[PDB]
Amino acid sequence: ARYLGPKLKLSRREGTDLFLKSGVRAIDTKCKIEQAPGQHGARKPRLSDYGVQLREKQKVRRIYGVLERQFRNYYKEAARLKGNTGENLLALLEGRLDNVVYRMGFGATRAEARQLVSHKAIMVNGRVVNIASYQVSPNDVVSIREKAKKQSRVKAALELAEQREKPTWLEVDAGKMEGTFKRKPERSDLSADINEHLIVELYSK
Amino acid sequence: MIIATAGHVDHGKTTLLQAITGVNADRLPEEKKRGMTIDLGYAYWPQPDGRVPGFIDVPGHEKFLSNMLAGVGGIDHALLVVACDDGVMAQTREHLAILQLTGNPMLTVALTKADRVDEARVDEVERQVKEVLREYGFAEAKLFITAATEGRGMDALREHLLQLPEREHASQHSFRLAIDRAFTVKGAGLVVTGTALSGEVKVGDSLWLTGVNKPMRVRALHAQNQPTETANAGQRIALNIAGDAEKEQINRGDWLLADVPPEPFTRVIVELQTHTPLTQWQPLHIHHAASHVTGRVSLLEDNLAELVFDTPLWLADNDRLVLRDISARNTLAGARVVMLNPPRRGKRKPEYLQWLASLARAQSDADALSVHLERGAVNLADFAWARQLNGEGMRELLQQPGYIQAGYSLLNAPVAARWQRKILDTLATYHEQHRDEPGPGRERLRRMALPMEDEALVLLLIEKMRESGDIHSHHGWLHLPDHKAGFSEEQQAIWQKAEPLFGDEPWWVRDLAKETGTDEQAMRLTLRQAAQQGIITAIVKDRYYRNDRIVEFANMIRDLDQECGSTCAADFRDRLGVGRKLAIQILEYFDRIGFTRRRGNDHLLRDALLFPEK
RNA sequence: GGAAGAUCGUCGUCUCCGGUGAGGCGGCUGGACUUCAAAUCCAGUUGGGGCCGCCAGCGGUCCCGGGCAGGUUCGACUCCUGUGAUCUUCCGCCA
RNA sequence: AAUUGAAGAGUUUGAUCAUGGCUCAGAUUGAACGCUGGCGGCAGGCCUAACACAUGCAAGUCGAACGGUAACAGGAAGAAGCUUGCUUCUUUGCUGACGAGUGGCGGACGGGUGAGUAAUGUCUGGGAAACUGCCUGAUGGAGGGGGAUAACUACUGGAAACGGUAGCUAAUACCGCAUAACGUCGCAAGACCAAAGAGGGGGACCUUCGGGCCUCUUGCCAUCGGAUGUGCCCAGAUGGGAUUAGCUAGUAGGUGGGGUAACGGCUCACCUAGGCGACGAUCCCUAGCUGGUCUGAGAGGAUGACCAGCCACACUGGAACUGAGACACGGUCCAGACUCCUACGGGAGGCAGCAGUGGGGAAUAUUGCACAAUGGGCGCAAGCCUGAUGCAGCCAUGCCGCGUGUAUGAAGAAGGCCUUCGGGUUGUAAAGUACUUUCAGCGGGGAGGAAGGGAGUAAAGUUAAUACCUUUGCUCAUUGACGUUACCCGCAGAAGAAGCACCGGCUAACUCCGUGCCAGCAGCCGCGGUAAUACGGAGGGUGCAAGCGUUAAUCGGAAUUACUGGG
Numbered sequence A: 001a002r003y004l005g006p007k008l009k010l011s012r013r014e015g016t017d018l019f020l021k022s023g024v025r026a027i028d029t030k031c032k033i034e035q036a037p038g039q040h041g042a043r044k045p046r047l048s049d050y051g052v053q054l055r056e057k058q059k060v061r062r063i064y065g066v067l068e069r070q071f072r073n074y075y076k077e078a079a080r081l082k083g084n085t086g087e088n089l090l091a092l093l094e095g096r097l098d099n100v101v102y103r104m105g106f107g108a109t110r111a112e113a114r115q116l117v118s119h120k121a122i123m124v125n126g127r128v129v130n131i132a133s134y135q136v137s138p139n140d141v142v143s144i145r146e147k148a149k150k151q152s153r154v155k156a157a158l159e160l161a162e163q164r165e166k167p168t169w170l171e172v173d174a175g176k177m178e179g180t181f182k183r184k185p186e187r188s189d190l191s192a193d194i195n196e197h198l199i200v201e202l203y204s205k
Numbered sequence B: 001m002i003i004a005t006a007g008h009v010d011h012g013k014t015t016l017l018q019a020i021t022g023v024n025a026d027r028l029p030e031e032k033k034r035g036m037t038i039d040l041g042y043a044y045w046p047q048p049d050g051r052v053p054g055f056i057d058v059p060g061h062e063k064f065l066s067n068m069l070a071g072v073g074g075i076d077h078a079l080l081v082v083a084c085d086d087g088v089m090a091q092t093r094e095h096l097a098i099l100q101l102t103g104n105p106m107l108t109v110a111l112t113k114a115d116r117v118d119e120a121r122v123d124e125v126e127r128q129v130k131e132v133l134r135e136y137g138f139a140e141a142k143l144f145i146t147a148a149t150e151g152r153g154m155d156a157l158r159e160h161l162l163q164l165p166e167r168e169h170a171s172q173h174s175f176r177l178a179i180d181r182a183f184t185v186k187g188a189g190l191v192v193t194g195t196a197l198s199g200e201v202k203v204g205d206s207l208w209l210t211g212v213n214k215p216m217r218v219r220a221l222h223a224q225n226q227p228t229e230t231a232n233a234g235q236r237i238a239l240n241i242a243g244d245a246e247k248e249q250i251n252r253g254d255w256l257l258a259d260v261p262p263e264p265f266t267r268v269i270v271e272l273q274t275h276t277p278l279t280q281w282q283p284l285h286i287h288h289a290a291s292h293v294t295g296r297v298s299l300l301e302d303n304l305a306e307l308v309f310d311t312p313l314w315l316a317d318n319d320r321l322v323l324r325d326i327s328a329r330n331t332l333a334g335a336r337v338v339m340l341n342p343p344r345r346g347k348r349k350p351e352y353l354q355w356l357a358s359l360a361r362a363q364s365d366a367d368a369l370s371v372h373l374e375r376g377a378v379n380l381a382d383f384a385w386a387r388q389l390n391g392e393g394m395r396e397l398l399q400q401p402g403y404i405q406a407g408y409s410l411l412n413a414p415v416a417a418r419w420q421r422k423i424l425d426t427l428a429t430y431h432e433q434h435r436d437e438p439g440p441g442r443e444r445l446r447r448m449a450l451p452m453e454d455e456a457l458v459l460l461l462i463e464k465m466r467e468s469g470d471i472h473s474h475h476g477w478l479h480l481p482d483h484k485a486g487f488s489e490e491q492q493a494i495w496q497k498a499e500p501l502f503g504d505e506p507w508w509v510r511d512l513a514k515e516t517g518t519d520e521q522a523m524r525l526t527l528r529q530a531a532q533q534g535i536i537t538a539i540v541k542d543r544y545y546r547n548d549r550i551v552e553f554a555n556m557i558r559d560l561d562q563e564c565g566s567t568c569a570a571d572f573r574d575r576l577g578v579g580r581k582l583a584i585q586i587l588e589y590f591d592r593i594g595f596t597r598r599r600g601n602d603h604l605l606r607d608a609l610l611f612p613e614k
Numbered sequence C: 001g002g003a004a005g006a007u008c009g010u011c012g013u014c015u016c017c018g019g020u021g022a023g024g025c026g027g028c029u030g031g032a033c034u035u036c037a038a039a040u041c042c043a044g045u046u047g048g049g050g051c052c053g054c055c056a057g058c059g060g061u062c063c064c065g066g067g068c069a070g071g072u073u074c075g076a077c078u079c080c081u082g083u084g085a086u087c088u089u090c091c092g093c094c095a
Numbered sequence D: 001a002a003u004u005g006a007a008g009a010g011u012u013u014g015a016u017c018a019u020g021g022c023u024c025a026g027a028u029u030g031a032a033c034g035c036u037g038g039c040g041g042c043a044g045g046c047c048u049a050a051c052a053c054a055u056g057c058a059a060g061u062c063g064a065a066c067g068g069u070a071a072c073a074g075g076a077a078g079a080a081g082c083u084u085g086c087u088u089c090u091u092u093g094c095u096g097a098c099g100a101g102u103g104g105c106g107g108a109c110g111g112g113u114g115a116g117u118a119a120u121g122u123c124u125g126g127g128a129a130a131c132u133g134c135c136u137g138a139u140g141g142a143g144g145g146g147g148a149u150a151a152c153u154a155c156u157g158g159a160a161a162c163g164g165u166a167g168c169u170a171a172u173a174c175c176g177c178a179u180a181a182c183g184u185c186g187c188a189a190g191a192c193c194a195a196a197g198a199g200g201g202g203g204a205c206c207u208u209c210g211g212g213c214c215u216c217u218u219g220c221c222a223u224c225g226g227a228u229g230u231g232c233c234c235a236g237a238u239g240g241g242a243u244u245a246g247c248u249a250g251u252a253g254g255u256g257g258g259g260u261a262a263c264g265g266c267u268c269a270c271c272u273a274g275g276c277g278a279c280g281a282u283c284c285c286u287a288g289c290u291g292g293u294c295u296g297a298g299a300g301g302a303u304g305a306c307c308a309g310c311c312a313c314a315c316u317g318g319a320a321c322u323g324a325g326a327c328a329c330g331g332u333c334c335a336g337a338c339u340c341c342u343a344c345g346g347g348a349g350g351c352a353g354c355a356g357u358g359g360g361g362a363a364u365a366u367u368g369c370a371c372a373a374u375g376g377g378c379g380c381a382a383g384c385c386u387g388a389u390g391c392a393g394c395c396a397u398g399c400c401g402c403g404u405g406u407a408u409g410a411a412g413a414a415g416g417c418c419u420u421c422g423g424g425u426u427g428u429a430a431a432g433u434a435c436u437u438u439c440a441g442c443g444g445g446g447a448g449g450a451a452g453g454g455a456g457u458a459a460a461g462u463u464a465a466u467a468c469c470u471u472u473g474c475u476c477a478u479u480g481a482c483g484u485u486a487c488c489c490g491c492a493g494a495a496g497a498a499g500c501a502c503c504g505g506c507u508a509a510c511u512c513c514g515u516g517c518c519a520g521c522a523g524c525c526g527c528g529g530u531a532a533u534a535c536g537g538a539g540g541g542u543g544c545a546a547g548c549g550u551u552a553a554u555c556g557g558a559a560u561u562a563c564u565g566g567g
């Protein structure tokens, strides 16, 4: 299910700081990221329209680490939703529990968030759960199990979270690393760099 | 207690079976039709006593004899008919030699046709049998004189059937079954019947059919016209089995067995036992229990041989078999499987004595096991297949002292350390190429020693070296404790004259790399190792600075938070006037060190040890 | 499995052949070889393994080879008695 | 809130733009083959031969209908051994219970197939000339008799199958009689029609001492309903073919008879000569139909597996009766073919039920468990029966979920590949360092499905009766095939887990080697003739992922049958 492969090479195929892995660094870039995605990556192909839109959809699907089929499922349901498809799509795409675990700050990577949720460490509304793919409910608290407490990594990532700035649309008290989701973000409150509509017309064939 | 009757045609074999039972062996329609033993017929005699004796009538035909060789498998006791009329015959002597070569544990003589001829002829056939029994070395036998029309022999024989011990075999073996006669009763399943050479099976068992290469569930089984939930080896076993496979795909000499076979082998080492001496590289019929084969023999020093099938076939170690001439008729010698896939170049002089060590020195599977571990890796699945190991038998290797057990092969600890020492000396040679290095990296070492050898065995062996403490490692580089980083001259001959000059002032690589004549990548060894010394630094790979400039550049960088209250770059320029290029390069230098952090306009300094404490 | 048969050169096929095997043809390789295909002639088509030394399932060396053998005979690819495998056909396919 | 919804490319020529097909990118599948494969949840799993089928199972049940005791266990007289009250055995339906027999009900439900059927069908929407057991409501009846017979007994046939002769007996079996209108006929008047009891308790009161008596329960008959189901009819809707245009005689109406529960040429006799139709009759070919499923933006088009309803069928052709309900999937009879046994005279059988075999084929499951639950048949009930069902087993066949690890880590190693030999590359990748044990394994804890029902209980109702019975509470214990369940808590170590396709363009992703229009690739326009970004392999990259790819079929693109939407 998980991608199981080197991360920053997929990140550097585009040359962007994809935040797939950070740790002590925010980004490496010292690995010659923009120059050698592959054997012929020293020269840059100009990449036709289908390739650029598809490549962006690949990029984003990788930053959120989801497989293609249930990704398309997110697409088709997001189209079934009322209102802007790209907007509500991206919002529910942020609804994945693992992304929320990363943005809450306890987690070295969204993949690590999949690890910690898989290990029963999370405790939602007084019940343990494992699906990181799950979309957090509005005004719903989420907590970590007290036995999950003691790992040093979580807080050390919180010191990174403080540097990250963290999203405003989710409210993590962080005094007990138990945050509350609030509502699915509106397009205005986030990003303004990624361009989601590329994916939807890419499926419009 | 399967007990096969054997002898030449029209000795009354079937008649004998009616004498004891009044029931018959013949089941094939044509034999019914033609009144003969065209092919092996089987009969069973279920009893209130609870034994069912197994009767096997077999052709006396030499032409059909290859089928008898199919039928002599699994015999517990053998009754060789001799008729008082015809008397002893050379074919009787042939059947005795064949059973002797099969190592059939015991046999009974039964004289027939006694009333039909005058008593002097009875005594003649008696004497001739008494002469013949002495030739093959079986000793006790109960000779019975009887007419079936008279019934004279019934009582002594009936006691004799019960007298025979059953030949028990060890419970710990993978199950193995020789397919013989395929036929499908309309009720549930294929039922395939065969002799079970080893191991145990039960009605719920799934068994691996070879060729189709698939597991198949057992629907039912009948032990010997004695239906039961379980079947032990050493008896013919009707075995009804679920599976997608059907009889049209099935052929005689297909194998049913517990575990996925190692691939069929033409080559095999075999024990030679011979009534008369043989000759190298000749065609002959190989006959094993329930197996008719044709292949060419080859001689391997003295009474050691390698059989080469032109048709690859599965077989396993310690399976006794008889070897007959390819035209049929003459039986010449016995054989036994000893090595299944001998390596090529097997004939070189030092080695044959050692093969003799593998086989003559060791009868027990454990002793052969230890020899094979000494030779090199023993993939447990294959060696186990040759010995048909069960998991309880698998534990014996754990019981063995001193063996290094990875996920499969064991390796002897002293011998492991020996192989380690050889790899270590090679590793010492690499240490000679650069004695300044603490030592070679691990992955280069794994490729440098024994690339062909197993990853589990090799990495575990390295872990054993770590347990010895012989390998201490830092920065992921594994090295011997002894190295003192003396300094290799290949580094030093440039580094000595270059060192004070590059030392006393910074100098760019190329600016006097031409004066030294050195290639740039060639300096991307000497200079980076000088960086490993910690003396000359590199902001960028091409230019190298001494530490003493970097330390001053640090102390002037230190003033930003105190003079400004901001980590603006501008003081490097506002104080000593150092340029923006080299300064930003110093910034990437500490950023890559992790010595300083970037945020917004300015650098955060949350962890560095260089900052003065107050 | 049984009752019968044909088949398994030396690149392939054939007439075969009791004379030291001979020849024909075809496929391809190289000469003749055309702006290409094609022609008709010439030379050739390395087979199998055994044994030995290398890691080189390759070389060196030797021996045998018309399925595998024998019986025959001055001489067996041949003829002859068998026999193995594959192939062809009928019968048989009983916890 | 009940919707939100439609993209193009390649190919004709030297080049252009049209016309016009052909091809591709999408989605889907009761798929298949191959490659590949760690786990789990939910679904689905002969579209081929309505071809042939062994063996077992799937339809039995009520003694609370009757005569009985075949078998089992009590009890009964008696045997009377001895272990002298332990055991011995005969007889004993007299009790629990029950084989077989008679009788009641079921067997017309449940499940399977889609052969036939183009209309006797199915759908929509109506209609009158009908019936409807068991359930339920109202309504009244329920009295008085006879003659038999299966079982059983003796005799006897036939290889078996299956009987046959004679004799005995009861029933809620049968047949009578009485009885009766808000029943049927009759304008009416009149005429005529029904039967069964059994069980439980019980005081007084009758006892031929069997029983009678009260009371209660439940059954039986009669009539009108209700619901339900079923039949019948009406008009339309529901394939193709006009290189099928003519078609039909009891067929179109009429009278009377006959016939159905019921209308009716449903049927017969007789009269008339009509009757059908280019709004496509007749004929031929094909086909189970619908709700719905896929596809599409939509309109349409194709399809009608699994789920659900209706019809049709049960080796083949047939036929009829019993029955509320049939011309009856495990009913009967006749004929035929196909298999099986026979003493050869004669007989027996029908998996398009659940499993299973064989055959066919590209090819698709357990001769498994339980009635624990739901549901159903019988029974007052307990219980009995249930291959319906509940489940599990098997398969990556499809959908969904997870894992095959995490973070850090430059001395950015080596090897490989490549190179201009400058160096790149593979790559934080590795190693290491620091973590982690999901799930599996191993070990514990441990739901709901289980509602009811049994026994007793107090009380109430009922009643002559504090009984019986009925109802409501309570106490006790008890009902699990699935199930070593679900679900949760421990143990230990990354320990058990990544492949497949593609890289000339369409179309995301390229270099070397080998080969030389050869071998070969190929959905399409194409490549390969000695340096192939198209063959073959390597490296590298791209795309999907426990799945991956070509083929199979429909729609889409195709506005390329163009109602929407063409000339």
Ligand SMILES: Nc1nc2c(ncn2[C@@H]2O[C@H](COP(=O)(O)OP(=O)(O)NP(=O)(O)O)[C@@H](O)[C@H]2O)c(=O)[nH]1
Residues within 6 Å of the ligand: B008, B009, B010, B011, B012, B013, B014, B015, B016, B035, B036, B037, B038, B057, B058, B059, B060, B112, B113, B114, B115, B116, B146, B147, B148, B149, B150
């Ligand atoms: N009178 C008599 N005849 C006997 C006796 N024993 C055997 N026979 C004879 O032996 C003959 C049968 O021989 P058979 O059983 O065919 O011998 P076989 O060795 O079994 N033949 P196959 O090799 O085909 O199996 C019978 O015909 C019978 O007459 C005996 O005691 N008395």
Ligand SMILES: [Mg+2]
Residues within 6 Å of the ligand: B012, B013, B014, B015, B036, B037, B057
């Ligand atoms: Mg015999």
